Amino acid sequence: TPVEEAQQKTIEAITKAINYMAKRRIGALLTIERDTGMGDYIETGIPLNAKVSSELLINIFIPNTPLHDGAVIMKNNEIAAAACYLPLSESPFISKELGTRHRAAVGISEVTDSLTIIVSEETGGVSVAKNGDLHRELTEEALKEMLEAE
Amino acid sequence: PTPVEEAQQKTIEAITKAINYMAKRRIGALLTIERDTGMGDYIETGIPLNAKVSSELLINIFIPNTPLHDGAVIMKNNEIAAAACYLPLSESPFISKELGTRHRAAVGISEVTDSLTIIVSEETGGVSVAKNGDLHRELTEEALKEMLEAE
Ligand SMILES: COCCOCC(=O)Nc1cccc(F)c1
Ligand SMILES: [Mg+2]
Numbered sequence: 147t148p149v150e151e152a153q154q155k156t157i158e159a160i161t162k163a164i165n166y167m168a169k170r171r172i173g174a175l176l177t178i179e180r181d182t183g184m185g186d187y188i189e190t191g192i193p194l195n196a197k198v199s200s201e202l203l204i205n206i207f208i209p210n211t212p213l214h215d216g217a218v219i220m221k222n223n224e225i226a227a228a229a230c231y232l233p234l235s236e237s238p239f240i241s242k243e244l245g246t247r248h249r250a251a252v253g254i255s256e257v258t259d260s261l262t263i264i265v266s267e268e269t270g271g272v273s274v275a276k277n278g279d280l281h282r283e284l285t286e287e288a289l290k291e292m293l294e295a296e
Numbered sequence: 297p298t299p300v301e302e303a304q305q306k307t308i309e310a311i312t313k314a315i316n317y318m319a320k321r322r323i324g325a326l327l328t329i330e331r332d333t334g335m336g337d338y339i340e341t342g343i344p345l346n347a348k349v350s351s352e353l354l355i356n357i358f359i360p361n362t363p364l365h366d367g368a369v370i371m372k373n374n375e376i377a378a379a380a381c382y383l384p385l386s387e388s389p390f391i392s393k394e395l396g397t398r399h400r401a402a403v404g405i406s407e408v409t410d411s412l413t414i415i416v417s418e419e420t421g422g423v424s425v426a427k428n429g430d431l432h433r434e435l436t437e438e439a440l441k442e443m444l445e446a447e
Contacts, residue, residue, distance in 0.1 A: 196347035201363035201380070205356050212352035229352070 156198050156223055157293045161286060163203035164263060164272055173267030174207040175217040175247050177232065178296065182258035188219050191230030198225055209267075217250065217262070233257065240280060243268075251275035261296045263289065307349050307374045308444045314354035315414055315423060316437055324418030325358040326368040326398040328383065329447065333409040339370050342381030349374055360418075368401060368413070384408065391431055394419075402426035412447050414440070 160176070167174045177184070192213060196202060198220065206213045206228050216229035235252035244266075251262035255275040262275040273282045274292050281292070297305070311327070318325045328335070343364060347353060349371065357364045357379050367380035386403035395417075402413035406426040413426040424433040425443055435443070 192350050192352050193348045194350075194353060196353075196376075197344045199343050199345075201343050202345060202347075205359065205362050205364045208356065208359050208362055211356045211359055213356045225347075 152223055156220075157290065159198045159200045159203065160263070160293065161290055162200035163207075164265060164289065165286060166200070166204050167207055167265045168270040168272050171267055171270040172207050172209060172265060173214075173247055174265040175232070175251060175262065176203070176264075177217050177219045177230075177251070177254055177260050177262040179219060179221040179226070180259040180261065180296070182260065184219055184221070184254075184258060184260060187217075187230050187232060187254065188221065188227045191216060191219065191227035193227050194225045195227075196225040198223065207265075217254075232262075235278075237278065241282070244280075248273065248275070248280060252278060252280050255279070261292065303374050307371075308441065310349045310351045310354065311371075311414070311444060312437065312441050313351035315416060315440065317351070317355050318358055318416045319421045319423050322418055322421045323355075323358050323360065323416060324365075324398055325354075325416040326383075326402060326413065327354070327371065327415075328368050328381075328402070328405055328411050328413040329371045329444075330373075330377070331410040331412065331447070333411065335370055335372075335405070335409060335411060338368070338381050338383055338405065339372075339378045342367060342370065342378035344378050345376045346378075347376045349376055358416075368405075383413075386429075388429065388431075392433070399424065399426070399431060403429065403431050406430070412443070 213228040218228045219226050232250040233253040234249045251264045252275045256278045264273045272284045364379040369379045370377050383401035384404040385400045402415045403426045407429045415424045423435045
């Protein structure tokens with residue numbers, strides 16, 4: 147169906163952008179709103195309400211640019227805003243070598259049903275936060291499986 | 297001011313802030329503002345954004361060596377319609393010989409539309425505008441803003 151084709155196109159755009167950033171070790175933080183509304187966090191960023199593309203996702207996260215600091219939040223198959231604030235987790239069970247991007251992802255996942263993707267600037271490793279847990283060192287296939295399951 | 301007028305002012309402020317930032321850093325840029333002649337054919341050649349304007353997004357689009365930086369951004373009213381768009385190249389002899397493809401594309405679209413295109417030179421940081429087949433170079437910040445307000 148059209149709804150199904152659109153969801154698959156968005157998954158492909160996300161995974162292509164994540165692969166590019168993982169290869170270049172570009173830090174990234176991408177939260178996908180689900181049933182819990184995240185308007186309060188969307189409002190802290192720069193409004194985009196843009197069509198998803200791998201190109202736009204990559205351009206947003208380039209280091210030392212206006213939009214790269216903070217989270218992209220996606221809602222209703224669009225990029226709602228960039229450079230958004232997310233709350234930092236205080237969980238003592240996050241790997242101690244991880245920094246604020248990962249703590250922000252876990253933090254939003256503690257108070258919403260959202261799915262957040264993180265690319266590490268240190269290693270290019272890809273992780274996902276959901277339900278208060280961080281799933282680390284994902285393969286491309288693992289991330290795709292999580293997006294399709296979501 | 298009406299909301300339409302306020303939105304137009306917000307969009308002009310976003311554009312001028314972005315152009316000033318890129319000019320200072322010699323970031324090449326090509327930004328076409330659709331007017332009454334529709335530019336759908338050219339919009340459809342690029343990557344669709346249909347995004348709210350911000351200075352931040354305009355700057356992020358044109359950063360060198362990124363997916364969206366080559367080609368034109370085309371704006372429709374208060375939105376960035378698409379990036380990395382094709383525009384036709386002018387053959388006008390009144391384009392300074394040292395100028396490259398962004399300036400020629402800007403003049404080219406200006407010959408077949410009533411659009412206003414802004415160009416930032418990656419060589420000099422100079423700012424120019426193409427309208428109605430003419431290129432006006434080395435604009436001050438004030439001159440650009442006045443041209444946009446008049447547009
Ligand atoms: C040019 O292709 C680059 C692909 O990089 C893949 C890579 O190193 N890490 C990676 C990418 C996507 C998801 C994931 F869990 C991990
Ligand atoms: Mg002069």
